[PDB]
């Protein structure tokens, strides 16, 4: 059972799962139960699926089990605030996609894998890791007793894997820039229509980006602690790059730590602030995410100024 104090807190966008590690599997079950009913999946199947998903996140500093549940929780808060707008299969597909979105991540970006001719880059040309994370999701669903979508029809089973596949591919940041530009135009003119499937996929796509970057929408002490974990992974990539005779970008160079506040400032102005601004225009109840992002942009502007 979930403690009473958490039941109120889990609904809010700023909830930090950080302090409840032993409760993360149960928090995911509670979010699924609240989002699509107590008989959303056969409980025994769901629990085996969750533990296998947990076992398939590596012990890397950032793209680990904790990140998967953080992203899942952010999606739950979007779905709890945007009732009736999402179908039952979408609510169901999106929570699973979020838990699985970074499965079997090795702490290396697509650029490294594409630059050092890694076997995964030969198999998957673009969105290299995201195509591997989707493959890991399908392999897990196909394990004995792990098929949580057994109750669905053929038509429904193939729809949910498609919601999941597009959702996991939308977590490739390289695709975010164009997707947000198209949504921004559609909204400003008045073309945006959620009944059109292509628009829906785009709206879901940006929700996946919002969820995946939600460490920038927590209270400042949490945002700062997560950033140290992201950088430990980025700096470990840059160290391998140095060993292979390639000077890494500043963001992955541990000798360039002093550029972090300015790098953070640019990531908020170019990536995160526009993401949550566009999301807020389409889904007004998601406003707390933009407000929290703005509060952390102000904290980074304070670090650079010397406050
Ligand atoms: Mg990812
Ligand atoms: Zn992620």
UniProtKB/Swiss-Prot annotation:
Disulfide bonds: none
Tissue: Abundant in the putamen and caudate nucleus regions of brain and testis, moderately expressed in the thyroid gland, pituitary gland, thalamus and cerebellum.
Binding sites annotated in the UniProt record for 3',5'-cyclic GMP: 63, 264
Domain PDEase residue range list: 1-307
Mutagenesis / variant outcome for changing residue 102 to A: Loss of activity and of zinc binding
Active site per database record: 63 (proton donor)
Domain of life (superkingdom): Eukaryota
Localization per Swiss-Prot or TrEMBL: Cytoplasm, Cytosol
Positions annotated to bind 3',5'-cyclic AMP: 63, 264
Coiled-coil intervals, chain numbering: none
Binding site for a divalent metal cation 2: 102
Residues that coordinate or bind a divalent metal cation 1: 67, 101-102, 212
Described function: Plays a role in signal transduction by regulating the intracellular concentration of cyclic nucleotides. Can hydrolyze both cAMP and cGMP, but has higher affinity for cAMP and is more efficient with cAMP as substrate. May play a critical role in regulating cAMP and cGMP levels in the striatum, a region of the brain that contributes to the control of movement and cognition.
Record comment regarding domains: The tandem GAF domains bind cAMP, and regulate enzyme activity. The binding of cAMP stimulates enzyme activity.
Disease link: Dyskinesia, limb and orofacial, infantile-onset: An autosomal recessive, early-onset hyperkinetic movement disorder characterized by axial hypotonia, dyskinesia of the limbs and trunk, orofacial dyskinesia, drooling, and dysarthria. The severity of the hyperkinesis is variable.
Stated family: Belongs to the cyclic nucleotide phosphodiesterase family.
Record's subunit section: Homodimer.
Name under which the protein is recorded: cAMP and cAMP-inhibited cGMP 3',5'-cyclic phosphodiesterase 10A
Originating species: Homo sapiens (Human)
Species classification: Eukaryota, Metazoa, Chordata, Craniata, Vertebrata
Interval of the full protein contained in this chain: 729 to 1035 of 1055
């Amino acid at each position: 059972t979930l403690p009473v104090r958490l039941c109120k807190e889990i609904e809010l966008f700023h909830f930090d799962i950080g302090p409840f590690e032993n409760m993360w599997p149960g928090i995911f079950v509670y979010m699924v139960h609240r989002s699509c009913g107590t008989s959303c999946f056969e409980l025994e199947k769901l629990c085996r699926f969750i533990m296998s998903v947990k076992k398939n996140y590596r012990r890397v500093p950032y793209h680990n089990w904790k990140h998967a549940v953080t992203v899942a929780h952010c999606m739950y808060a979007i779905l709890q605030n945007n009732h009736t707008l999402f179908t039952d299969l979408e609510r169901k597909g999106l929570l699973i996609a979020c838990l699985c979105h970074d499965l079997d991540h090795r702490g290396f970006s697509n650029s490294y894998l594409q630059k050092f001719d890694h076997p995964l880059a030969a198999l998957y040309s673009t969105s290299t890791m995201e195509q591997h994370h989707f493959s890991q999701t399908v392999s897990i669903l196909q394990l004995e007793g792990h098929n949580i979508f057994s109750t669905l029809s053929s038509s429904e089973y193939e729809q949910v894997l498609e919601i999941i596949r597009k959702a996991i591919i939308a977590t490739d940041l390289a695709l975010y820039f164009g997707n947000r530009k198209q949504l921004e135009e559609m909204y400003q003119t008045g073309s945006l229509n959620l009944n059109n499937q292509s628009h829906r996929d785009r709206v879901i796509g940006l929700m996946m980006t919002a969820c995946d970057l939600c460490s920038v929408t927590k209270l400042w002490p949490v945002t700062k602690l997560t950033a140290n974990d992201i950088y430990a992974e980025f700096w470990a990539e840059g160290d391998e790059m140095k060993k292979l005779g390639i000077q890494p970008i500043p963001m992955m160079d541990r000798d360039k730590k002093d550029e972090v506040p300015q790098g953070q400032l640019g990531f908020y102005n170019a990536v995160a602030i526009p993401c949550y601004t566009t999301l807020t225009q389409i889904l007004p109840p998601t406003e707390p995410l933009l407000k929290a992002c703005r509060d952390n942009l102000s904290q980074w502007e304070k670090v650079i100024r010397g406050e």
